[PDB]
């Protein structure tokens, strides 16, 4: 619930408060206050843990020191309890990889693409620094990070305990994200923008009618109904 | 000056024509008014013959291609979301009194 | 056991002063990941110079740019001029000077109290300096051995102050006899 | 040329969230030391001579 | 050992910080004042901790915008397009649910 | 009194219920035991709430 720095500075403040209470309580010959250095440390510790006092400073200055230590203790313990309540109430799990930049800057999580496909070619030819860095890694990674089929990549993600991320088209990713056991997730935005097309041999007689049909099915909303 | 100013000079040199840049009067890209059916913006300037060519971030769309001609794309793009960043807040010094 | 107490307090004063001075002068306070002299590479940033390493031109480094709501302006000013770490160094120096002068002009047994007060105040200034440093850094990372040299100087300064006050109490106890 | 060559651009509680309470604590320790020394100087000057 | 003005102030301060007492009132009137101040302290410090927990818990379950699906499922963040353009037309004609 | 077995059980119970002390250990070993018990109590009661 508290940052490492808060704990470290709590310990420094404990030592400082104990030493200043010992100094102020017993330094003037006219006071000669049962606060020796050991008893000062005990008083400060027991004040921090909101525990018994058994001795309280009687001087004005020892009382100033005690009062500010008491205020500090109240605020710090209240804030520890509050932040622990916050942690327990709303749990949140962190996804190691947020974007492709994330994959490129690390090596604990392996990542690859379909062994043969437009995704692999996107990386092999990218002139974008992050993607070129990812290609440099993927093409030389051993064992191979490439897979023969999409299903193989999905299974490698599912069986690698989070040590394998898979680069694939958003369409396939969105579909698998809606499939049991619901253990995969699409993270970040898309790395590029492109489209699927109906392909015919160069110069095919079917080229014009099939291009027009795709546009008709597009314009009448058939393609959205079929994706849904 | 700008990307399209640089591109206009080059299109004109490679096509061999002299040209005059004019800013579209209504400051719009181009839509067909549902009602008056009139085309506004840069598309309108071409449809009604006020301009001979449009060199701008004009999106190739089916409805526009039905009334004007477009070259192959000179830029690829898509609709995106623009948000104000999150701007991490710096807590006040005496914020324990909040 | 007087006599060995004086040696222990003098050694402690010198150790605290040396550690705090090395901490301020050295620049390994924070192992961040940022830009070296004007690609993101690691850096051994310090109180004054954010210095580079594991880079194209590692070892070449510059002066941290402290500045890019008066509260932020005041904190940035206090963290730009390391007034609190430097004040800790000055107070440890004056405490050591008082301890040294406790041999000459002896029998005052009122300057060794001043030595204790100086060491305690040096510790308090040191902790304020650490707090402002960490708070300003919040405007992955780690802390270097310069940071821990400052912290260890704080601990040794507080112990030496407790010894000095103990010796002052013992001296007035002997005088009252 | 026109986009990039001329481009102009935790869960735990942090020490910043509570730094004020540390400042108050150390200020109070300093004030306590000042008050103690003022009283000691007063008494040390109040001895009949 | 008895409640003068300075000792009265110290007792009150220590009772507020829940930091125990080196001495407590012994008379009926002193005990009424002490009991009532103890009740006040209990309610105020419990309420401070509870409201700090509310602040942190509420600030922890906030979430930003990461997609068009996100914009569609919420209403606190408004969103729009150029009043005349290919973006506005993309949405006016989309047959995609989101 | 000093910590016999019954008084030590009473000290520990009162420490856990955060109900302060009537006695507290005075020796270094007693104080180490009391310190770790106080830390344990603080973490457990805070975690319960
Ligand atoms: C009787 C018992 C004795 C008790 C003794 C009480 C003593 C009270 C001391 C309090 C010190 C205040 C310091 C300060 O103003 O902080 C400044 C930071 O600037 C710094 O970084 C502060 C520098 C270190 C302070 C050293 C002491 C900012 O403070 P601000 O501008 O005032 O805050 C308003 C705006 N804000 C909340 C957004 C920040
Ligand atoms: C006899 C008793 C001896 C004395 C015992 C003293 C101990 C009590 C101190 C408490 C903290 C006091 C300081 C409270 C902090 C004030 C800060 C503040 O007011 O912040 C303003 C803010 O910026 C919005 O205006
Ligand atoms: C005067 C007599 C003195 C009495 C003494 C009583 C002791 C009270 C404190 C106990 C807890 C201290 C131990 C804290 C241990 C912290 C654990 C740690 O170091 O964290 C591990 C790591 O940093 C993260 O992975
Ligand atoms: C032995 C001597 C001890 C002396 C005694 C010390 C005081 C006791 C402490 C707190 C009293 C709290 C009083 C609570 C008053 C409650 C008011 C109330 O209940 O009104 C709400 C209403 O019913 C809704 O409709
Ligand atoms: C009153 C003085 C002592 C109170 C007990 C405080 C415990 C101190 C712990 C210090 C180290 C904490 C390390 C946590 C950070 C991490 O887990 O990485
Ligand atoms: C506000 C509260 C009142 C502040 C103090 C007023 C001064 C009255 C004179 C008291 C003299 C000190 C006597 C004592 O210690 O009991």
Author numbering:
A (entry chain D): 520 to 551, 569 to 764
B (entry chain A): 422 to 519
C (entry chain E): 5 to 42, 55 to 84, 92 to 162, 173 to 210
D (entry chain A): 765 to 773, 784 to 823
E (entry chain A): 569 to 666
F (entry chain C): 569 to 617
Question: What sentences appear in the manuscript?
Answer:
AMPA glutamate receptors (AMPARs), the primary mediators of excitatory neurotransmission in the brain, are either GluA2 subunit-containing and thus Ca2+-impermeable, or GluA2-lacking and Ca2+-permeable. AMPA glutamate receptors (AMPARs) mediate rapid signalling throughout the brain, and orchestrate various forms of synaptic plasticity that underlie learning. These cation channels assemble in various combinations from four core subunits, GluA1–4, with each contributing unique gating kinetics, trafficking and subsynaptic localization. AMPARs exhibit a modular architecture with a two-layer extracellular region connected to the transmembrane ion channel (transmembrane domain, TMD). The ion channel is encircled by diverse auxiliary subunits, modulating receptor gating kinetics, pharmacology and ion flux, with the transmembrane AMPAR regulatory proteins (TARPs γ2, γ3, γ4, γ5, γ7, γ8) being the most abundant.
